Amino acid sequence: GSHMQDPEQLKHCNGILKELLSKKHAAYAWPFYKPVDASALGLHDYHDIIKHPMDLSTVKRKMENRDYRDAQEFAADVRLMFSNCYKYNPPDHDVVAMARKLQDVFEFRYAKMPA
Ligand SMILES: O=C(O)c1ccccc1-c1ccccc1C(=O)Nc1ccc2c(c1)[nH]c(=O)c1ccccc12
Ligand SMILES: [Cl-]
Ligand SMILES: [Cl-]
């Protein structure tokens, strides 16, 4: 059920999203900007391993379209995106290092959400 704080909290989420997409973080955020194009990358097993792809452009579309009803729903998608990276890639891959850095940005600011 919607709470009177959900709009406020979703603004905090949108602020985080905007930060994740900003130039500040581009050196490590860029792999997460758009859906993984598995064929283009030669990742022909990606969609056998990753059942629920997620990326920041999809999170942005969902936010713009008011698809997210609360902050928890938003956070679950951002975390899904990172988990897909941790699932698919060896843990020493540079994309995993990038994901961990971007997730640290996310988690520290998400934990400042007004309530
Ligand atoms: O070549 C390597 O990079 C390599 C290095 C170490 C071990 C294996 C390989 C490899 C070997 C053969 C073919 C391809 C790869 C490879 O892993 N590529 C690749 C490229 C882009 C992304 C990705 C994986 N995985 C993501 O999760 C992802 C998420 C967002 C955007 C892009 C990517
Ligand atoms: Cl994905
Ligand atoms: Cl979660």
Residue numbers in the entry: 341 to 455
From the paper:
The BET family proteins (BRD2, BRD3, BRD4, and BRDT) contain two tandem bromodomains and an extra-terminal domain at the C-terminal. The tertiary structure of all bromodomains contains a left-handed α-helical bundle formed by four α-helices (αZ, αA, αB, and αC).
Here, we discuss a newly identified small molecule inhibitor (NSC127133; hereafter, L10), a phenanthridinone derivative, of the second bromodomain (BD2) of BRD2. The BD2-L10 crystals diffracted to an atomic resolution of 0.91 Å resolution in P22121 space group, with one molecule per asymmetric unit. The L10 compound, which binds in the deep hydrophobic cleft, is surrounded by the amino acids P371, V376, L381, L383, Y386, N429, H433 and V435. One important feature of L10 binding to BD2 is the direct double hydrogen bonds of phenanthridinone O9 and N9 atoms to the carboxamide side chain of N429. Moreover, the O9 atom of L10 is also hydrogen bonded to a conserved water molecule W3 (2.92 Å), which forms a three-way hydrogen bond to the backbone amino and carbonyl group of C425 and N424, respectively, and to the sidechain hydroxyl group of Y386. The carbamoyl moiety, which links the phenanthridinone and phenyl-benzoic acid group, makes direct electrostatic interactions with NE2 of H433. As speculated, the ligand L10 binds significantly well with BRD2-BD2 and the dissociation constant (KD) estimated by globally fitting the equilibrium state response observed at different L10 concentrations is 213.7 μM. Superposition of the BD2-L10 and BD2-H4K5ac complex structures reveals that the binding of phenanthridinone ring moiety of L10 mimics the Kac binding with the BD2.
